[PDB]
Structures are given as structure tokens and as C-alpha cells.
Design a protein around this ligand. Structure first.
Ligand SMILES: [Ca+2]
Ligand code: NI
Length: 142
């Protein structure tokens, strides 16, 4: 995969916003996982919380890297979730489910040369907020 993080500075959005946890914080080029350092997103405590980045055009995606929240003992909120790739028409082109990060600070997700415009993280869990320190997206190596 390429080394350029193509998610950086792109339009990001999420199911709702709480505690000032703006969606753009996951694409601000700062993986700092401490919520108090203002680089981690936060939705409402809600069902099926989600976060999305629009890559702005269709890209051949090979890797999505998630950086979890690290302060406050709430890392396990990022559990039982999908990482989803959508095309320009917003149809799913790939989807991977994950149980846990197992206390790891980050998760590398590898996709098999998928042409996608949107990258989405979807919690499948009830009444839980989605918080991401960063989401980085990399093109497949040519
Ligand atoms: Ca960040
Ligand atoms: Ni501090």
C-alpha cells in the first residue's frame, strides 16, 4: 500500500456529535488518543453509532487504520463494529467485522484492492458512542 494517508483533511461526518467530539478529529493528522487533547471524535450514546470519511473521489483502497481512544478506560467501546467501503453511489463494496481491538491502540484493516469513495466505521452495539482518535486510509500499491 502507498504511504500517503488520503483520509487526511477530507470531509468527515458521524451519526451525532457529543462532548464537542467533532468527526473531523479523526482526519486531523493527529493520532493522540487522549480525549482531553481534542483529537478524538465522540458521538451520542446511541444505537449503531457510525463515522464516515468521504475520500472525495473513487480510490483503490488497500488499508484502513483505526486509532482507538486511549484515556479513561473506555477503549472497549470500539468493539463489535464493521469497517465498510462504499462506492460513489454509496453502495457497499466491502465490509469487515471486528469483535475487539484487544486493548491494542490501533487496528490495521486490509482490503483487497477495493474501488471506494467512502470509508465508514459502524458500531453494532446498543447505546454506545463511537470515538476514534484517527482513521487513516491508504491506496493499494501499484
Ligand atoms: Ca485525530
Ligand atoms: Ni494531557
Amino acid at each position: 500500500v502507498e504511504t500517503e494517508n488520503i483520509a487526511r483533511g477530507k470531509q468527515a461526518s458521524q451519526s451525532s456529535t457529543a462532548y464537542g467530539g467533532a468527526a473531523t478529529r479523526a482526519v486531523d493528522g493527529n493520532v493522540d488518543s487522549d480525549y482531553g487533547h481534542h483529537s478524538v471524535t465522540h458521538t451520542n450514546f446511541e444505537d449503531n453509532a457510525w463515522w464516515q470519511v468521504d475520500l472525495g473521489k473513487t480510490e483503490n483502497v488497500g488499508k484502513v487504520k483505526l486509532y482507538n481512544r486511549g484515556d479513561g478506560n473506555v477503549a472497549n467501546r470500539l468493539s463489535n463494529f464493521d469497517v465498510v467501503l462504499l462506492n460513489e453511489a454509496k453502495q457497499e463494496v466491502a465490509r469487515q467485522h471486528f469483535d475487539s481491538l484487544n486493548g491494542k491502540a490501533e487496528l490495521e484493516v486490509f482490503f483487497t484492492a477495493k474501488d471506494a469513495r467512502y470509508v465508514k466505521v459502524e458500531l453494532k452495539t446498543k447505546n454506545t458512542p463511537l470515538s476514534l482518535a484517527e482513521v487513516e486510509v491508504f491506496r493499494s500499491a501499484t
